[PDB]
Design a protein around this ligand. Structure first.
Ligand SMILES: Nc1ncnc2c1ncn2[C@@H]1O[C@H](COP(=O)(O)OP(=O)(O)O)[C@@H](O)[C@H]1O
Ligand SMILES: [Ca+2]
Ligand SMILES: [Ca+2]
Ligand SMILES: [K+]
Ligand SMILES: [Mg+2]
Lengths: 351, 117
């Protein structure tokens, strides 16, 4: 039998079949219920008029189990058309997910969906494996959460995992905010999806923020255009790099949190000195919010500045890192050894 | 229960497997030291017992192969009670220890087994 691979993303579910090189189903992690049954994903956005919309896994931790079960039913029946009770399932979880949350997801899978066998994988560990490594630190920046996850010889080091206190959604919201300088008033949920696309299409990370502010003011070379759904054109200038700069300077968002460079550094420092060289030499980016042009070179400069000068800093930016969690799950669940890693329903039910 | 795990690390010597369609497949001993640039491999060196696991990544191997090599390395180490030291070996930048396992030195060949993806 062929396993199903479900990456439970804070912003979008990625799902598909073991052995594929990418997820066949990607849809928003949203559940819509009548304002005065439930709709999931794109269907729920299309009906935002007549629905109240909710994110059940806003920051990578499931907070509404009824809605999460609707998302999983949508995954199996409307997206994959797969009987969950006839396939092994690999499910992903956030770094530092509480055991009680893992146990509740496991209960739902075994008792509501009757899945015959299941394995739960840490998202960042799967990304590391998808990069062809057993040791490294993964910087996974998604929609509602980011984490830095040191991994040694296959296993995350729980005492060193850090949360970076912003993610892609925060960046979309910040671009929405700073576009008010130019007179734009994007504010509705639907306009927010537009601004998300603007961010993905036009933004980039400056190698040196202060120098880019200086060079961008000296001409209009920075300005780039985008066609709105109504055919109007918007032009964006220094917002293109000021928006993702908040990953490095969360004070731009009014947060006291450390930026992703500082967080990665602190995360590595939690690991014993004898393994840090291998972490610094294997800093692996994953997730959609690591997709900005310029991120690897900027992160290399900044972590090199912070780290002892004897360390060799290597930031790895795989081209298909937006889906590397899901890909790592597809590989693991395809291995000839996967059948020895999972828990069966019979074992669970008799445990 | 995987048959090759059951054979791993029982005697001093050198064991080489190639990732082939999501499985670990012994390399014919007559090919030891020649590595297809299109493939990924797992190598266990046992010394009288000390264990060193190396996973070797060809410049043209596919993502399923390099990922499986990494994961099989972890699984073999666990099967050996965590006692193996793991080493990532990239074509053309291999450790002197890994190169030292092959009297004739390391060599590379074009091609490889097809991707499982
Ligand atoms: N090319 C891109 N550039 C910048 N951000 C991107 C790009 N592609 C996607 N994103 C952002 O990545 C986030 C989704 O990333 P993902 O890793 O799928 O998150 P999650 O797993 O938390 O659902 C969104 O905020 C999205 O806007
Ligand atoms: Ca190959
Ligand atoms: Ca070990
Ligand atoms: K330094
Ligand atoms: Mg994610």
């Amino acid at each position: 039998v062929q396993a199903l691979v479900v990456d439970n993303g804070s912003g979008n579910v990625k799902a598909g079949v073991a052995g594929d090189d990418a997820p066949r189903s990607v849809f928003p992690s949203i559940v819509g219920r009548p304002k005065n049954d439930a709709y999931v994903g794109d269907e729920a956005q299309t009906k935002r008029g007549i629905l109240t919309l909710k994110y059940p896994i806003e920051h990578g931790i499931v907070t509404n189990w009824d809605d999460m079960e609707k998302i999983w039913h949508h995954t199996f029946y409307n997206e994959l058309r797969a009987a969950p009770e006839e396939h092994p399932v690999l499910l992903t979880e956030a770094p530092l997910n509480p055991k009680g949350n893992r146990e509740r997801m496991t209960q739902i899978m075994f008792e509501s969906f009757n899945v015959p066998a299941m394995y739960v994988a840490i998202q960042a560990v799967l990304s590391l494996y998808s990069s062809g490594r057993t040791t490294g630190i993964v910087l996974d920046s998604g929609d509602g959460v980011s984490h830095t996850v040191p991994i040694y010889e296959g296993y995350a080091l729980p005492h060193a995992i850090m949360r970076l206190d912003l993610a892609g959604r925060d960046l979309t919201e910040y671009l929405m905010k700073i576009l008010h300088e130019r007179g734009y008033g994007f504010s509705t949920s639907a306009e927010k999806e537009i601004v998300r696309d603007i961010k993905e299409k036009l933004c980039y990370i400056a190698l040196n923020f202060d120098e880019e502010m200086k060079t961008s003011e000296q001409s209009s070379d920075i300005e780039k255009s985008y066609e709105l759904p109504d055919g109007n054109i918007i032009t964006v200038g220094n917002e293109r790099f000021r928006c993702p700069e908040a990953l490095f300077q969360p004070s731009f968002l009014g947060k006291e949190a450390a930026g992703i460079h500082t967080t990665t550094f602190n995360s590595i420092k939690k690991c014993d000195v004898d393994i840090r060289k291998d972490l610094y030499g294997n800093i692996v980016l994953s997730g959609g919010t690591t997709m900005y042009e310029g991120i690897g070179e900027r992160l290399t400069r900044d972590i090199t500045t912070l780290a002892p000068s004897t360390m060799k800093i290597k930031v790895v930016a795989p081209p298909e890192r937006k889906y590397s969690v899901w890909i790592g799950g597809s590989i693991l669940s395809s291995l000839s050894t996967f059948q020895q890693m999972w828990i069966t329903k019979e074992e669970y039910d008799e445990s | 229960e995987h048959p090759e795990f059951l054979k791993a690390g029982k005697e001093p010597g050198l064991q080489i497997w190639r990732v082939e369609k999501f499985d670990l497949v012994p390399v014919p001993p007559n090919l030891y030291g020649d590595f297809f640039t299109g493939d990924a491999y797992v190598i266990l060196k046992t010394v009288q017992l000390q264990y060193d696991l190396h996973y070797w990544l060809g410049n043209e191997c596919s993502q399923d192969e390099s990922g499986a090599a990494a994961i099989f390395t972890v699984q073999l180490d666990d099967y050996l009670n965590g006692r193996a030291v793991q080493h990532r070996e990239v074509q053309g930048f291999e450790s002197s220890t890994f190169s030292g396992y092959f009297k004739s030195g390391l060599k590379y060949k074009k091609g490889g087994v097809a991707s499982g993806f």
